[PDB]
Design a binder for this molecule. Structure first.
Ligand SMILES: [Zn+2]
Length: 369
């Protein structure tokens, strides 16, 4: 099989303002052509009739618990949840044990990702050594080794002078600082912190990404900074939307929230979400809060742009990372379907609507329903 033809689907690629009933031809792990009615020899054909065909999803906030808490989740089990949920690329947080503050840990995660061979797992580095909040980490080395962002996630930066230094360095390197996830409260004020981050981002030219927002005022502050050209973004977990749910839904509706990111947070006594993010987001679509195109933007090109990777598109020549889903397929996360080592989600046992049928990474099927 030299080629794949994804046939009969409704293709949506927001990055190109492209949508319609088209086929996709994939060769050499790349998008080769998008056209009506493609047939070539030596191909596998996926029949996407009645399905939505779009770039592979990108989750920029996942806790894989690896190294150090691999009984809760590991790179393999999280990657299995990821591809089952349409994600071809996930970004793992650095509050592992040991934390991702040196190239040995970085290389560990990259080699795991390679051997597991499902989704791309991109590491982040810590902002400070040991995430202790005192001494800035070596962002140059960590980036060179493959880190795509920096965060003390686990534990928000409390030292304003550390945040400024972090954003300074981030600006030199062309990578974001992620801030304001308290995952450490179980692996191991909001408005003021966001305003601080917006101010420092403006002052340094660095990109800050707010990992958790919960109030209308936080959203209004973020939108203010964005309107003034400050490189600030934010995310929401669609699983949490079904604090201040309603303000968050208005923030999605108005485009203040840039992307869906799960904050997949395995625990065995934050919620898991990679495997359910899509049906959760689709509930907002079915309720008229967002268009399907906007839903796709928030899973694809928007998070790609936040982390500066050339993914989240179906542009000719790009990696053939492709998600194929049925917006109306009902299913339940339970013991028959769960690929996490944990079960910590209020969606457990509930009827979900929307399911990934195929996930394709570099032209290879890595998930099929
Ligand atoms: Zn986190």
């Amino acid at each position: 099989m030299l080629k794949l033809i994804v046939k009969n689907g409704y293709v949506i690629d927001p990055s190109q303002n492209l949508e319609g009933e088209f086929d996709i031809l994939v060769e050499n792990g790349k998008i080769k052509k998008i056209d009506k009615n493609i047939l070539v020899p030596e191909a596998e054909i996926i029949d996407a009739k009645g399905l939505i065909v779009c770039p592979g999803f990108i989750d920029i906030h996942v806790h894989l618990r690896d190294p150090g808490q691999t009984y809760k989740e590991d790179i393999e089990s999280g990657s299995r949840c990821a591809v089952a949920g349409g994600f071809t690329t996930i970004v793992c947080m650095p509050n592992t044990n040991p934390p991702i503050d040196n190239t040995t840990v970085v290389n560990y995660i990259l080699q795991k990702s390679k051997s597991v061979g499902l989704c791309r797992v991109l590491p982040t580095g810590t902002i400070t050594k040991g995430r202790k909040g005192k001494e800035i980490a070596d962002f140059y080395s960590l980036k060179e080794a493959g880190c795509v962002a920096f965060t003390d996630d686990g534990s928000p930066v409390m030292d304003s002078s550390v945040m400024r230094k972090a954003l300074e360095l981030a600006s030199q390197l062309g990578v974001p600082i992620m801030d304001h996830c308290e995952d450490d409260k179980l692996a191991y004020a909001e408005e003021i912190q966001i305003a601080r981050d917006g101010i420092l981002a403006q002052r340094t030219g660095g990109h800050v990404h707010i990992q958790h927002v919960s109030t209308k005022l936080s959203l209004e502050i973020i939108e203010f900074f964005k309107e003034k050209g400050v490189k600030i973004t934010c995310e929401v977990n669609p699983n949490h939307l079904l604090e201040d749910r309603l303000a968050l839904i208005e923030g999605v509706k108005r485009g203040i929230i840039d992307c869906f990111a799960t904050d997949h947070a395995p625990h065995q006594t934050g919620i898991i979400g990679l495997q359910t993010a899509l049906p959760s987001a689709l509930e907002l679509y079915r309720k008229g809060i967002i268009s399907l195109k906007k839903l796709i933007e928030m899973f694809t090109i928007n998070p790609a742009r936040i982390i500066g990777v050339d993914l989240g598109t179906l542009k000719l020549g790009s990696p053939a990372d492709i998600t194929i889903f049925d917006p109306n397929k009902e299913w339940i996360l339970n013991e028959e379907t769960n690929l996490s080592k944990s079960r910590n989600t209020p969606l457990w046992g509930k009827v979900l609507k929307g399911k990934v049928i195929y996930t394709i990474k570099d032209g290879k099927m890595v998930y099929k329903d």
